[PDB]
Amino acid sequence: DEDETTALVCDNGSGLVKAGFAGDDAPRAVFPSIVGRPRHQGVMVGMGQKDSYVGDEAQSKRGILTLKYPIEHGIITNWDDMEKIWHHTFYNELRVAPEEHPTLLTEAPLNPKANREKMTQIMFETFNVPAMYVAIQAVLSLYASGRTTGIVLDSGDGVTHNVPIYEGYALPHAIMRLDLAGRDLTDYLMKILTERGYSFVTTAEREIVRDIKEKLCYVALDFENEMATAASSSSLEKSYELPDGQVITIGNERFRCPETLFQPSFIGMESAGIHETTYNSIMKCDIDIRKDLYANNVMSGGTTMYPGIADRMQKEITALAPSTMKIKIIAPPERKYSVWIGGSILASLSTFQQMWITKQEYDEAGPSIVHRKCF
Amino acid sequence: DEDETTALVCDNGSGLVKAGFAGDDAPRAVFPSIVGRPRHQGVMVGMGQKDSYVGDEAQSKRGILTLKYPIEHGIITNWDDMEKIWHHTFYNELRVAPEEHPTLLTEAPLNPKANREKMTQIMFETFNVPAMYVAIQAVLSLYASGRTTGIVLDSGDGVTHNVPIYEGYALPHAIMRLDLAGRDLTDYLMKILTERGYSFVTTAEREIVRDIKEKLCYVALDFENEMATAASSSSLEKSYELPDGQVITIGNERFRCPETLFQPSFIGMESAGIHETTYNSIMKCDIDIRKDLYANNVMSGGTTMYPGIADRMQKEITALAPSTMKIKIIAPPERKYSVWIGGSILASLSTFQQMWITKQEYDEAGPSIVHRKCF
Amino acid sequence: DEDETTALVCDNGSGLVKAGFAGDDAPRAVFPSIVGRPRHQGVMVGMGQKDSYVGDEAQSKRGILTLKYPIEHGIITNWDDMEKIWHHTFYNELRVAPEEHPTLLTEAPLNPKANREKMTQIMFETFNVPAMYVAIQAVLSLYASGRTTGIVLDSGDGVTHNVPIYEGYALPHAIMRLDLAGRDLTDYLMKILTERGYSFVTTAEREIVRDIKEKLCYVALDFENEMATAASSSSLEKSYELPDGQVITIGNERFRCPETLFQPSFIGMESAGIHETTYNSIMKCDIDIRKDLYANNVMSGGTTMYPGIADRMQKEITALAPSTMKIKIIAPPERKYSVWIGGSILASLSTFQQMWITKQEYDEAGPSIVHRKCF
Amino acid sequence: MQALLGARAKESLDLRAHLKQVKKEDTEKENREVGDWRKNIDALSGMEGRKKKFES
């Protein structure tokens, strides 16, 4: 199935796991970060039926399953479900045995330390991986984009990291991590759709609202003007097909939900939005750094695909920035996946083959070693 | 005497009782659920003549008997008469004493507990069966049909069950058990035929009407067009031969009686009818489980032989159902006998041999054990 | 009956409508949200009779009526029936009507907005109300309870809202709406009473099982210990008198129905129960809010009349809550009536006299005005 | 691109033909209850003489 003894890459978020091998430009498969379990009483004998479902299995049989996500707000807490997702990911779909391949995993630098320690431990103790390396999603985004400098807004499912990097160096005092992500936008949409008469509360219903957002939503370049017409006419409405033949029609809610990115107060968060975080990450850096960060704002991850987002962000930051200065956004088509690609790039660089924790150093030190060896 | 000690299988309804051995595709014999008793003074001596008759004996000698049915709306109200029926069914006719074989009986999943408990008690205490298992009728319908997913609507003589099952699991919150059944259709026909000039009130008369229904009645997929002609012309009437050579003809009443399954008000019942209960069994399930239940309406039990019932049950559901969605009725030849056949299938599964109540566990726990071990 | 143009207050649910005039601390009368219709053909003449019956008329003549409820989960689906109920409520029994009085309505914060738009149109165009306001049920519960802060569990008939309020302000990001209410608890009870041999299907039967729940059921502080005894001994059983002189004897079903509040899985709902739901409304608020919401768990609406609810809720929240913290519960005798009572308080507060929509603003803007002027 | 849909088709055919198989099993292992009987007759071929009993 694979023709090289290369590194493996797995970007594990609170939404989905993107997994494949180092040297490619795409994951072999994307496995949702889900372990599903039946919530109903069985009645038929000898008709199979599993006790639990993993990844794509969990979504395929979801009609009667409650679906749980092992990762919350950027970190892994249900380490047991992570090991099952990984076993499936590696052995059934990537068709690899990590014992024979070094593995690269990712996190955000302002996430809690336990995440990198448990991810490292699972790969060394249950998979016997010869080596490990936990990467920075912002680093991977800059490699994928062809940059050494910029502000990376990685749009996670859990959290948004917001980090300035200059000439390959971290500028950590200027990181503005924000507790606003794709799962919060999804929760907001469940509540706004309730206002319109469509109640979405169960797992199947929650998965649908996420799917509605992905297909119907946008941010808009100008929220107030967009709402002035969206709130006044059916001409800005779009219908979504619910998987039972019924439809839901959504109007200004189509953008009011993504608007939370610019207005986090919509979900109860105290924040001025993603353009404030971008701005402060530049502003808190020295003036001989700022010129290069203004010219290199980097969009990575999901939400970066919303209509109006690259143009809106450039407008929102140039509005806060000084005049004369050029404010620019980098937003490649390798959207929602460029961080995976960055994983592939880093994992396969010759400059990175000395960065690995080996299964010698790990066995001698234990998982706390990841804090000294990765970043 | 048998090649193997397989379970005896018997489906005890409010209408018919059917039995045979596990592993075959048909019951050996069918009996009415009847115990008969003379309603006349004997005058000749040495005429044989029993104090009570069972099953086919009761029906064959019915000219001077009053006939009683021990089962009503799916449950046994007279266990003494069922004891007589089981002895006749299993030992006199299949020629197997339950003492040497496990016995598989059946009941609806929302069938009152006293009935599943009494069936367990009698087979263990009066027949000394070595093991028991009371099957879910919907499960057996699915086993006989070759389905794991669908709505089992068993429209029998006793009760219509309406249960949604997905991937071998029940969705109990969506079961619409309804007290509308084939026995009511028979009594309605006795009354409507009275209106036509052919009164029916006695046991013999009821058995004639049940025979008329079974040979002459139908549902009509489009009853409005069917009655517009049937109620206007003799060309739509069908003749029936009565036991004494009389002939009765029936016109729109021929389908108006079965129509009660869709129009329950004809017998004074407050109900939406079987097509709406099928609809709600589907509609009350999660949206990722309805797309499969709409495509799998599973017909079972008796009354399913009326021409037009499958098409009449698919058209009405389609009318209630969302557009785009495919609505499909499954109405196999294993109709009316599907529960018995499914019983045979369940009994022979290797995985089902771990489901039996033994005649050890039974005495330690008592008959309430049926709720710990069966369902 | 009245000598002043006081505001009228109506609390309209899927159960009953509580109604009376502002300034009172109780409704003047209760009007079941019912329209009854005969399900039988009339034979006698000179019998009076109605084409349709409402409220208490509908219940008094119910022996031959089918009884329908115009409201589902807080939404009016049949407003023509509500206008008949309201006409009776106002002109026949309360002896007050919107025509000569301003009117306050009670609603949930996420009640579909279209529902307020229609009720607004009806009171202004059918009943000619000079002014309107639609108030939050949680607000009304807090005024009636003597609080400005707390989690209000408004326990409706078809839905429970669960909204945290602090210092008079909504904390909407922490609303944990649950599709579980008093009408669903009734469904569980009738299914388990069906298992005991007492099916409840038709209208008269539906009303009886609701009445059984209200008079016999309770939650208790400890379900498992209550069941260990109730499932073992007749000393925990109670016989309820049915309308025809027969009785139903109920054991642990007496508490299993109410228990669905703590165990929603009993009716097929994917939920951890009202104490977890209350816990999350507190726990998702900022930590300097949390202490005041833990000290103010407010029970309102219906089902809170179940014995042991104050203790069951306080103990479960305390178990979920951080240690040191004091968890307190409010469960006043103004239960089930506190939403109506709060409506009276709010309608009459001097601070609220300018909060009314006049029938000037209404016609200039139309019914959608409620979305801008009320909430 | 050719293996995944193949596997899905294998699973679907397995479930359907397997419910067909479990029911056809019951059909084939027991084909005795779907049989019949000879139902012979005595017919009293002796319309040349009568019987000994007092009733005859």
Side-chain angles (χ1 to χ4, degrees):
Chain A
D1 292 300
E2 298 291 357
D3 57 339
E4 182 60 294
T5 58
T6 186
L8 305 176
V9 178
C10 302
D11 186 21
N12 298 274
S14 67
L16 301 99
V17 179
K18 298 186 289 295
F21 66 89
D24 206 332
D25 62 335
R28 289 290 307 277
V30 179
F31 304 84
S33 295
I34 301 172
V35 178
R37 294 180 173 88
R39 71 185 186 88
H40 297 92
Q41 174 67 55
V43 296
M44 303 187 75
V45 177
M47 307 278 104
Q49 304 305 314
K50 296 175 179 171
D51 54 290
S52 63
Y53 296 79
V54 178
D56 52 304
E57 291 178 339
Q59 289 178 323
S60 293
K61 258 72 179 177
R62 68 187 180 273
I64 58 169
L65 307 177
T66 180
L67 302 183
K68 304 296 184 183
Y69 291 84
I71 298 168
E72 295 183 354
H73 298 292
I75 64 170
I76 183 68
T77 62
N78 189 336
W79 76 268
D80 186 65
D81 286 348
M82 174 176 266
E83 188 273 333
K84 288 188 284 294
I85 292 167
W86 285 351
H87 188 80
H88 174 67
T89 296
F90 290 123
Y91 289 90
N92 292 332
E93 292 295 332
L94 270 57
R95 301 288 179 86
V96 298
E99 184 178 3
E100 297 181 2
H101 304 276
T103 300
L104 184 150
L105 304 176
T106 66
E107 68 175 16
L110 294 181
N111 287 142
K113 286 166 68 173
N115 185 60
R116 63 170 74 185
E117 291 175 351
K118 295 301 290 183
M119 289 191 296
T120 299
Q121 182 172 45
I122 293 167
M123 291 305 297
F124 282 115
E125 297 182 29
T126 66
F127 292 90
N128 297 313
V129 71
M132 292 294 290
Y133 187 85
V134 179
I136 298 168
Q137 289 173 313
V139 168
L140 298 182
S141 295
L142 289 171
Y143 281 115
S145 293
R147 295 291 185 274
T148 62
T149 301
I151 307 299
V152 180
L153 285 87
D154 55 0
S155 296
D157 300 299
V159 298
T160 300
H161 184 67
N162 300 302
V163 57
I165 299 171
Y166 179 82
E167 293 283 318
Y169 288 80
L171 303 172
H173 64 284
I175 298 167
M176 301 292 148
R177 183 174 65 75
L178 176 65
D179 287 337
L180 175 62
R183 293 281 291 277
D184 296 300
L185 296 177
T186 300
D187 190 71
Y188 186 74
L189 184 61
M190 289 189 280
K191 289 180 173 64
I192 206 166
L193 296 178
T194 299
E195 290 179 350
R196 284 177 75 86
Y198 292 75
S199 172
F200 296 91
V201 297
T202 67
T203 294
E205 292 172 336
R206 292 194 296 273
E207 291 291 295
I208 292 167
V209 172
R210 175 183 56 75
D211 196 71
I212 292 168
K213 183 176 76 70
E214 292 172 357
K215 292 184 175 72
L216 274 66
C217 289
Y218 65 99
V219 296
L221 182 58
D222 182 327
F223 176 80
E224 292 76 10
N225 287 339
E226 191 71 18
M227 188 174 180
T229 61
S232 298
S233 178
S234 66
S235 66
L236 279 82
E237 291 183 335
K238 182 169 169 68
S239 298
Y240 174 90
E241 180 180 348
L242 300 169
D244 65 0
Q246 297 185 99
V247 299
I248 183 167
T249 300
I250 301 169
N252 64 25
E253 301 85 4
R254 190 173 174 198
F255 50 98
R256 286 161 64 197
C257 294
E259 181 65 13
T260 301
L261 292 172
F262 296 95
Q263 296 182 64
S265 67
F266 287 7
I267 60 167
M269 179 64 197
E270 184 188 354
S271 175
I274 62 169
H275 57 293
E276 181 69 24
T277 61
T278 301
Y279 180 74
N280 288 335
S281 291
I282 297 167
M283 184 185 77
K284 297 294 187 181
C285 297
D286 289 349
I287 66 290
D288 285 321
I289 296 171
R290 289 181 181 181
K291 74 185 199 297
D292 296 292
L293 295 175
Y294 276 119
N296 296 280
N297 288 313
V298 178
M299 299 294 104
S300 179
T303 79
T304 62
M305 292 177 72
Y306 285 129
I309 194 66
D311 295 298
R312 170 129 192 217
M313 285 292 285
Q314 188 172 289
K315 182 176 182 291
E316 290 291 358
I317 283 76
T318 195
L320 299 175
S323 69
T324 302
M325 178 58 69
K326 173 66 178 178
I327 294 86
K328 182 176 178 180
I329 294 175
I330 299 168
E334 304 209 320
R335 299 259 236 311
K336 139 191 235 179
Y337 292 91
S338 67
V339 70
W340 184 87
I341 293 168
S344 180
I345 293 167
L346 178 58
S348 63
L349 297 178
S350 66
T351 66
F352 178 71
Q353 300 306 310
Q354 301 302 310
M355 293 297 291
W356 291 110
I357 300 166
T358 66
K359 188 179 187 297
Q360 181 65 49
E361 290 173 313
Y362 176 85
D363 287 347
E364 292 173 3
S368 67
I369 193 167
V370 70
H371 189 67
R372 293 192 300 275
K373 294 289 186 176
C374 294
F375 63 92
Chain B
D1 297 297
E2 294 292 321
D3 289 346
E4 180 59 292
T5 55
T6 66
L8 298 176
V9 179
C10 182
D11 183 11
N12 305 301
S14 69
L16 303 173
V17 180
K18 300 191 300 296
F21 296 97
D24 70 350
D25 202 33
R28 173 63 185 82
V30 53
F31 307 94
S33 298
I34 298 173
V35 177
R37 293 179 172 87
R39 69 184 186 87
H40 290 267
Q41 174 66 56
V43 295
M44 300 185 76
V45 298
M47 298 292 103
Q49 305 303 310
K50 296 176 178 172
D51 54 291
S52 62
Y53 296 83
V54 59
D56 55 305
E57 293 178 340
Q59 189 178 54
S60 294
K61 298 293 185 179
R62 69 186 180 273
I64 49 74
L65 305 176
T66 180
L67 303 182
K68 304 295 183 183
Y69 289 79
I71 297 170
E72 181 176 356
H73 296 296
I75 62 170
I76 299 167
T77 63
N78 184 328
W79 68 267
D80 188 75
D81 286 346
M82 286 304 300
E83 182 169 351
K84 290 179 179 65
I85 291 168
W86 286 328
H87 181 75
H88 183 67
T89 298
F90 293 121
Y91 182 75
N92 290 341
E93 294 285 307
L94 301 181
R95 312 300 296 172
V96 180
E99 183 177 2
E100 295 178 354
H101 290 253
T103 299
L104 181 64
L105 301 179
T106 37
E107 51 92 66
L110 300 179
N111 189 272
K113 287 171 75 177
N115 186 53
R116 67 185 77 181
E117 290 174 352
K118 185 60 65 179
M119 287 189 286
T120 300
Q121 182 172 42
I122 299 303
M123 293 307 298
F124 282 118
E125 296 182 26
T126 65
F127 293 98
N128 297 311
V129 70
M132 288 291 289
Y133 192 89
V134 181
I136 299 168
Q137 288 171 312
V139 169
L140 299 186
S141 294
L142 290 171
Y143 279 138
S145 296
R147 303 285 168 162
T148 58
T149 299
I151 306 302
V152 179
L153 195 151
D154 56 350
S155 293
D157 191 80
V159 65
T160 299
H161 200 61
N162 300 301
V163 54
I165 300 172
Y166 182 84
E167 293 287 327
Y169 290 81
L171 289 316
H173 66 283
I175 297 169
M176 300 297 107
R177 184 170 67 75
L178 174 65
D179 294 327
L180 178 63
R183 186 176 292 181
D184 296 303
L185 297 178
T186 299
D187 287 342
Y188 184 72
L189 184 61
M190 291 172 75
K191 289 180 181 178
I192 205 166
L193 296 178
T194 299
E195 290 180 352
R196 291 182 66 76
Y198 294 79
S199 295
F200 297 91
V201 297
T202 67
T203 294
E205 289 172 339
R206 184 171 287 105
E207 293 299 303
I208 292 168
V209 173
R210 57 157 320 168
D211 195 65
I212 291 168
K213 183 186 79 174
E214 291 172 7
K215 293 183 174 74
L216 274 68
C217 289
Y218 67 100
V219 173
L221 71 90
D222 184 326
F223 78 94
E224 290 180 346
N225 288 337
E226 191 69 14
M227 75 187 288
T229 300
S232 297
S233 177
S234 66
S235 67
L236 271 284
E237 292 184 348
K238 178 72 178 178
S239 297
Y240 173 87
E241 180 185 342
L242 279 82
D244 58 357
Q246 292 182 74
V247 177
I248 186 167
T249 65
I250 305 172
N252 58 298
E253 304 88 353
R254 188 175 167 202
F255 61 89
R256 186 174 175 87
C257 294
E259 183 182 336
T260 301
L261 293 173
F262 298 87
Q263 298 293 309
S265 67
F266 292 178
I267 59 169
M269 179 65 191
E270 182 184 350
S271 175
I274 70 96
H275 58 292
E276 186 166 352
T277 58
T278 302
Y279 171 72
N280 284 330
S281 292
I282 296 166
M283 202 67 179
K284 298 293 184 182
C285 296
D286 290 348
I287 65 288
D288 286 316
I289 295 161
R290 287 194 221 141
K291 80 168 200 305
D292 296 291
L293 296 175
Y294 277 117
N296 294 274
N297 294 312
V298 178
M299 181 174 280
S300 187
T303 79
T304 53
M305 290 206 208
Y306 289 127
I309 188 65
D311 300 296
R312 177 67 186 279
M313 98 158 305
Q314 186 179 287
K315 182 179 178 184
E316 290 288 357
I317 294 165
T318 300
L320 294 171
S323 66
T324 300
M325 181 60 70
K326 173 67 178 178
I327 296 89
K328 170 71 177 175
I329 189 69
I330 301 163
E334 290 80 3
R335 30 206 202 178
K336 120 200 238 180
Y337 298 91
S338 62
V339 173
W340 186 90
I341 292 166
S344 180
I345 186 167
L346 177 60
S348 70
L349 295 174
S350 67
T351 57
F352 182 66
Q353 305 310 310
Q354 300 301 310
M355 295 296 289
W356 291 107
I357 298 166
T358 65
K359 190 177 190 299
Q360 180 64 47
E361 290 173 311
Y362 173 79
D363 291 304
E364 292 175 2
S368 67
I369 193 166
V370 70
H371 194 63
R372 293 180 179 87
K373 298 290 186 176
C374 296
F375 187 72
Chain C
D1 293 87
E2 300 292 333
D3 57 349
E4 181 59 292
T5 58
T6 184
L8 304 180
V9 179
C10 300
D11 186 9
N12 295 281
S14 61
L16 60 80
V17 180
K18 292 191 170 81
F21 61 90
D24 221 309
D25 205 47
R28 175 155 202 227
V30 296
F31 300 91
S33 297
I34 301 172
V35 179
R37 293 180 172 88
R39 69 185 185 88
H40 290 271
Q41 173 66 55
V43 296
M44 300 185 78
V45 299
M47 297 294 102
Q49 304 300 304
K50 305 294 185 182
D51 57 315
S52 64
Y53 298 80
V54 299
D56 54 303
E57 293 176 335
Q59 290 176 319
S60 292
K61 300 299 192 186
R62 68 187 179 273
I64 58 168
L65 307 178
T66 178
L67 301 183
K68 305 294 186 181
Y69 292 80
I71 298 168
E72 295 183 356
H73 308 290
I75 297 96
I76 298 167
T77 63
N78 184 328
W79 44 86
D80 291 342
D81 283 351
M82 289 304 299
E83 287 181 354
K84 290 189 284 292
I85 292 166
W86 283 329
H87 185 81
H88 175 72
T89 296
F90 292 138
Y91 294 95
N92 293 336
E93 295 292 316
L94 296 175
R95 305 289 183 79
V96 294
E99 182 177 358
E100 297 183 357
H101 298 269
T103 300
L104 184 148
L105 302 175
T106 66
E107 293 294 354
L110 295 171
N111 189 275
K113 70 182 183 180
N115 192 45
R116 289 185 287 154
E117 185 176 5
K118 182 57 64 178
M119 293 177 81
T120 298
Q121 183 172 43
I122 293 167
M123 293 298 171
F124 282 112
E125 297 180 31
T126 298
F127 297 102
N128 296 313
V129 72
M132 295 186 76
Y133 188 82
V134 181
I136 298 297
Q137 289 174 310
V139 168
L140 300 181
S141 293
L142 290 171
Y143 283 120
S145 298
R147 295 291 185 275
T148 62
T149 300
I151 306 300
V152 180
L153 286 87
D154 58 359
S155 298
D157 189 79
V159 63
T160 301
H161 182 62
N162 304 312
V163 53
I165 298 172
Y166 178 81
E167 293 284 314
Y169 302 72
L171 302 173
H173 70 286
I175 294 168
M176 302 291 150
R177 185 180 64 81
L178 175 65
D179 291 339
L180 175 62
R183 174 82 48 187
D184 296 301
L185 298 179
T186 300
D187 180 62
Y188 189 75
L189 181 60
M190 71 179 76
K191 287 184 168 75
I192 64 177
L193 295 178
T194 298
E195 289 184 350
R196 288 172 69 94
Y198 293 79
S199 297
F200 297 88
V201 178
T202 66
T203 296
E205 293 170 350
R206 291 202 298 275
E207 292 294 299
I208 293 166
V209 66
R210 178 184 58 76
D211 195 66
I212 291 168
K213 181 186 79 188
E214 291 177 7
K215 292 185 175 73
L216 274 69
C217 291
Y218 63 94
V219 296
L221 68 90
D222 182 328
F223 177 79
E224 292 77 10
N225 287 338
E226 188 69 17
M227 186 170 279
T229 300
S232 298
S233 177
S234 66
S235 67
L236 274 284
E237 291 183 336
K238 173 71 177 176
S239 297
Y240 171 93
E241 181 180 348
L242 301 170
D244 61 355
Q246 295 187 92
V247 300
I248 182 168
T249 300
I250 302 174
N252 66 27
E253 299 85 6
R254 192 172 178 192
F255 53 91
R256 288 164 62 187
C257 163
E259 188 65 13
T260 299
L261 290 173
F262 295 91
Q263 297 289 339
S265 69
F266 281 15
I267 60 168
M269 177 65 207
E270 188 185 351
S271 174
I274 63 169
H275 57 293
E276 185 71 24
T277 300
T278 299
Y279 169 69
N280 286 333
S281 291
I282 297 167
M283 200 67 181
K284 298 295 185 181
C285 295
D286 290 348
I287 65 288
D288 287 322
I289 296 171
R290 287 179 196 178
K291 74 185 198 296
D292 295 288
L293 295 174
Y294 278 117
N296 294 282
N297 182 16
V298 178
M299 304 301 293
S300 190
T303 79
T304 58
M305 284 232 192
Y306 286 135
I309 195 66
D311 295 293
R312 186 60 203 277
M313 287 295 288
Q314 185 178 26
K315 290 178 184 293
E316 288 293 347
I317 294 167
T318 300
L320 295 171
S323 66
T324 301
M325 181 61 71
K326 303 296 185 182
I327 294 84
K328 299 180 183 180
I329 186 162
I330 295 96
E334 288 80 19
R335 33 207 197 177
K336 106 214 234 191
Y337 298 93
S338 66
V339 172
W340 183 90
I341 293 167
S344 179
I345 293 167
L346 179 59
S348 67
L349 292 177
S350 65
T351 61
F352 183 74
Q353 297 305 304
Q354 299 300 312
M355 292 295 289
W356 286 97
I357 298 168
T358 65
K359 190 176 190 296
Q360 180 64 48
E361 290 171 312
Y362 171 80
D363 289 305
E364 291 174 3
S368 67
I369 191 167
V370 71
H371 298 157
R372 281 98 74 187
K373 293 291 189 178
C374 295
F375 62 89
Chain D
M1 75 283 275
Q2 77 292 351
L4 72 173
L5 76 171
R8 309 310 104 74
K10 304 146 192 150
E11 274 92 63
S12 173
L13 175 46
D14 189 350
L15 64 88
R16 195 274 303 161
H18 183 27
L19 295 174
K20 176 67 184 69
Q21 182 55 43
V22 291
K23 61 169 170 279
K24 86 157 61 60
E25 282 151 50
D26 315 291
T27 70
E28 52 79 20
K29 293 179 179 179
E30 295 289 341
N31 298 115
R32 307 287 75 75
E33 295 85 357
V34 286
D36 213 6
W37 183 223
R38 273 73 191 271
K39 182 72 211 153
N40 42 66
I41 179 174
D42 187 10
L44 320 182
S45 158
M47 64 181 181
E48 298 297 330
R50 181 177 65 83
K51 318 315 161 203
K52 314 259 213 172
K53 54 210 70 183
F54 59 88
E55 183 255 340
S56 174

